[PDB]
Motif scaffolding. Structure first.
Motif, PDB file in Angstrom:
ATOM      1  N   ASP A  35      -0.493  -0.091  -7.059  1.00 39.34           N
ATOM      2  CA  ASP A  35       0.124   0.094  -8.497  1.00 39.34           C
ATOM      3  C   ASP A  35       1.595   0.410  -8.961  1.00 39.34           C
ATOM      4  O   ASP A  35       2.346   1.357  -8.459  1.00 39.34           O
ATOM      5  N   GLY A  37       2.588   1.336 -11.611  1.00 37.81           N
ATOM      6  CA  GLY A  37       2.884   2.472 -12.612  1.00 37.81           C
ATOM      7  C   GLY A  37       3.181   3.596 -12.043  1.00 37.81           C
ATOM      8  O   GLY A  37       3.432   4.664 -12.833  1.00 37.81           O
ATOM      9  N   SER A  38       3.216   3.604 -10.576  1.00 39.81           N
ATOM     10  CA  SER A  38       3.429   4.934 -10.068  1.00 39.81           C
ATOM     11  C   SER A  38       4.183   4.539  -8.823  1.00 39.81           C
ATOM     12  O   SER A  38       4.078   3.456  -8.325  1.00 39.81           O
ATOM     13  N   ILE A  75       0.003  14.930  -8.546  1.00 31.15           N
ATOM     14  CA  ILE A  75       0.435  13.990  -9.434  1.00 31.15           C
ATOM     15  C   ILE A  75      -0.833  13.960 -10.813  1.00 31.15           C
ATOM     16  O   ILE A  75      -1.908  14.489 -10.539  1.00 31.15           O
ATOM     17  N   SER A  76      -0.289  13.311 -11.632  1.00 29.92           N
ATOM     18  CA  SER A  76      -1.418  13.309 -12.990  1.00 29.92           C
ATOM     19  C   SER A  76      -1.146  11.991 -13.376  1.00 29.92           C
ATOM     20  O   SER A  76      -0.026  11.533 -13.880  1.00 29.92           O
ATOM     21  N   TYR A  77      -2.086  11.133 -13.435  1.00 27.86           N
ATOM     22  CA  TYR A  77      -2.095   9.820 -14.055  1.00 27.86           C
ATOM     23  C   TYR A  77      -2.408   9.680 -15.471  1.00 27.86           C
ATOM     24  O   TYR A  77      -2.682  10.965 -16.154  1.00 27.86           O
ATOM     25  N   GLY A  78      -2.061   8.674 -16.215  1.00 29.47           N
ATOM     26  CA  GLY A  78      -2.382   8.447 -17.551  1.00 29.47           C
ATOM     27  C   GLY A  78      -3.753   8.438 -18.134  1.00 29.47           C
ATOM     28  O   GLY A  78      -4.135   8.622 -19.066  1.00 29.47           O
ATOM     29  N   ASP A  79      -4.493   8.316 -17.266  1.00 29.99           N
ATOM     30  CA  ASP A  79      -6.105   8.364 -17.591  1.00 29.99           C
ATOM     31  C   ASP A  79      -6.841   9.459 -17.365  1.00 29.99           C
ATOM     32  O   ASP A  79      -8.165   9.729 -17.413  1.00 29.99           O
ATOM     33  N   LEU A 122      -3.505   5.396  -3.211  1.00 25.77           N
ATOM     34  CA  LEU A 122      -2.668   4.330  -4.008  1.00 25.77           C
ATOM     35  C   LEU A 122      -1.374   4.066  -3.161  1.00 25.77           C
ATOM     36  O   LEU A 122      -0.894   4.960  -2.372  1.00 25.77           O
ATOM     37  N   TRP A 194       9.897   2.576 -14.372  1.00 23.25           N
ATOM     38  CA  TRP A 194       8.812   1.587 -14.567  1.00 23.25           C
ATOM     39  C   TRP A 194       9.401   0.210 -14.502  1.00 23.25           C
ATOM     40  O   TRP A 194      10.826   0.131 -14.931  1.00 23.25           O
ATOM     41  N   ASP A 218       2.292  -2.909 -15.534  1.00 23.04           N
ATOM     42  CA  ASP A 218       1.616  -1.972 -14.730  1.00 23.04           C
ATOM     43  C   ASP A 218       0.174  -2.784 -14.158  1.00 23.04           C
ATOM     44  O   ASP A 218      -0.534  -3.008 -14.729  1.00 23.04           O
ATOM     45  N   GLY A 220      -1.852  -1.618 -11.977  1.00 28.57           N
ATOM     46  CA  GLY A 220      -2.739  -0.369 -11.908  1.00 28.57           C
ATOM     47  C   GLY A 220      -3.287  -0.070 -13.160  1.00 28.57           C
ATOM     48  O   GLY A 220      -3.832   1.324 -13.051  1.00 28.57           O
ATOM     49  N   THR A 221      -3.335  -0.609 -14.386  1.00 27.44           N
ATOM     50  CA  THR A 221      -3.744  -0.348 -15.607  1.00 27.44           C
ATOM     51  C   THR A 221      -4.624  -1.567 -16.046  1.00 27.44           C
ATOM     52  O   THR A 221      -4.196  -2.855 -15.921  1.00 27.44           O
ATOM     53  N   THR A 222      -5.938  -1.202 -16.236  1.00 28.72           N
ATOM     54  CA  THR A 222      -6.947  -2.477 -16.525  1.00 28.72           C
ATOM     55  C   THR A 222      -6.561  -3.219 -17.811  1.00 28.72           C
ATOM     56  O   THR A 222      -6.618  -4.310 -17.578  1.00 28.72           O
ATOM     57  N   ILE A 298       1.350  -1.123 -22.513  1.00 28.24           N
ATOM     58  CA  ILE A 298       1.338  -0.931 -20.981  1.00 28.24           C
ATOM     59  C   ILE A 298       0.469  -2.191 -20.730  1.00 28.24           C
ATOM     60  O   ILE A 298      -0.713  -2.583 -21.030  1.00 28.24           O
TER      61      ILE A 298
ATOM     62  N   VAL B   2      -8.909   2.315 -16.189  1.00 30.93           N
ATOM     63  CA  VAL B   2      -7.885   3.195 -15.292  1.00 30.93           C
ATOM     64  C   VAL B   2      -6.434   2.891 -15.836  1.00 30.93           C
ATOM     65  O   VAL B   2      -6.267   1.680 -16.201  1.00 30.93           O
ATOM     66  N   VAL B   3      -5.844   3.807 -15.577  1.00 31.13           N
ATOM     67  CA  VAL B   3      -4.618   3.906 -16.178  1.00 31.13           C
ATOM     68  C   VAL B   3      -3.647   4.782 -15.425  1.00 31.13           C
ATOM     69  O   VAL B   3      -3.488   6.133 -15.414  1.00 31.13           O
ATOM     70  N   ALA B   5       1.471   6.665 -13.552  1.00 28.90           N
ATOM     71  CA  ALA B   5       1.951   8.001 -13.699  1.00 28.90           C
ATOM     72  C   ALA B   5       2.795   8.177 -14.772  1.00 28.90           C
ATOM     73  O   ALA B   5       3.883   8.079 -14.801  1.00 28.90           O
TER      74      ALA B   5
END
Lengths: 325, 6
Positions: A35, A37-38, A75-79, A122, A194, A218, A220-222, A298, B2-3, B5
């Motif tokens: 990923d 994005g993290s 941690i807290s992801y965006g989804d 991840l 990022w 990113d 790791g973002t679909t 994104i 899926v997305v 941090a």
């Protein structure tokens, strides 16, 4: 597979891509989602109380190179997914490169979407300004400082399920068989931790659906998530209909669609017609682009499975070229 | 979806 070469597995219809990583001594293979994005490297552990029974779990007791750490993480992801646990130290083998003494985050708890997905955790590839714990050196930081890579780069090739899936990550190198033409160099803004870039404009046929905007690369973002006015503008170009949940319903018949073209630093990059349709469910198709209430886009797998990217952590900058297909 | 941090 060459040194620092990690073959990827395409999950579903280009949902995500994961590769194997060996952690510990003698070590176990973990399927981690790569990923950009993290920046946290976490894995399911035997300390975990709500983990998937399918997940491979890291066992401190079975690694003679495990070293306890008194810190915790969350941690807290965006989804909306999350994970939490404790820090530890051990060795990580990424494509033949043994990173010694990498800070690994062992999960005690995780969101159910993690428990039910294909990942054991991840591998984050963002800058270290965003690690959840201050002072943690990411795997790229360690490959550089331990001298395991001579160039502070990673070449990313994400495949299309329609063509057989797959994908490949190369640490400290890139592969010109996977792209066509010349690479275009694009400066990166990492002030938010990022891989931020500027898209000069976006067109559909002869229509300018958008002027310059910022986005983050990113892996790791679909999907391709755009700010509300941009998304709206793109959808109008395709007759897509808003499903009111950040997604669009689009024609399953992409044969008449014109590609969505991004003008980045003077060159043209696109989302081919076929990538405009993410998934088909009972004859209804979800578009490859969505919306979020962010000032920035994104730039996810919808775009990345169409364009090869060389990520340079050192400058930082990226090199992009159309995938060879 | 899926997305990852934010």
């Amino acid at each position: 597979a060459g040194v620092g070469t990690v073959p990827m597995t395409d999950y579903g219809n280009d949902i995500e891509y994961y590769g194997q990583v060996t952690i510990g001594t003698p070590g176990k293979k973990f399927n981690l989602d790569f990923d950009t994005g993290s920046s946290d490297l976490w894995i399911a552990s035997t300390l975990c109380t709500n983990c998937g029974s399918g997940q491979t779990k890291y066992d401190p007791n079975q690694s003679s190179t495990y070293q306890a750490d008194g810190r915790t993480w969350s941690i807290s992801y965006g989804d909306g997914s999350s994970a939490s646990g404790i820090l530890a130290k051990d060795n990580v083998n990424l494509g033949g490169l043994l990173i010694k003494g990498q800070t690994i985050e062992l999960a005690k708890r995780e969101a159910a979407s993690f428990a039910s997905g294909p990942n054991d955790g991840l591998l984050g590839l963002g800058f270290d300004t965003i690690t959840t714990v201050r002072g943690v050196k990411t795997p790229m930081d360690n490959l550089i400082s331990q001298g395991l890579i001579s160039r502070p780069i990673f070449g990313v090739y994400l495949g299309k399920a329609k063509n057989g899936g797959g994908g490949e990550y190369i640490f400290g190198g890139y592969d010109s068989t996977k792209f066509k033409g010349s690479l275009t160099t694009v400066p990166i803004d990492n002030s938010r931790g990022w891989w931020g870039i500027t898209v000069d404009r976006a067109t559909v046929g002869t229509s300018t659906v958008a002027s310059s905007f910022d986005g983050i690369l990113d892996t790791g973002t679909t999907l391709l998530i755009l700010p509300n006015n941009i998304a709206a503008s793109v959808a109008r170009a395709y007759g897509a209909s808003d499903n009111g949940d950040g997604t669009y319903t689009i024609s399953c018949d992409t044969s008449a669609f014109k590609p969505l073209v991004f003008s980045i630093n003077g060159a043209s990059f696109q989302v081919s017609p076929d990538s405009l349709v993410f998934e088909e469910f009972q004859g209804q198709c979800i578009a490859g682009f969505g919306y979020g209430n962010w000032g920035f886009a994104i730039i996810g797998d919808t775009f990345l499975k169409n364009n090869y990217v060389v990520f340079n952590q050192g400058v930082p900058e990226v090199q992009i070229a159309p995938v060879a297909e | 979806x899926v997305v990852x941090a934010x």
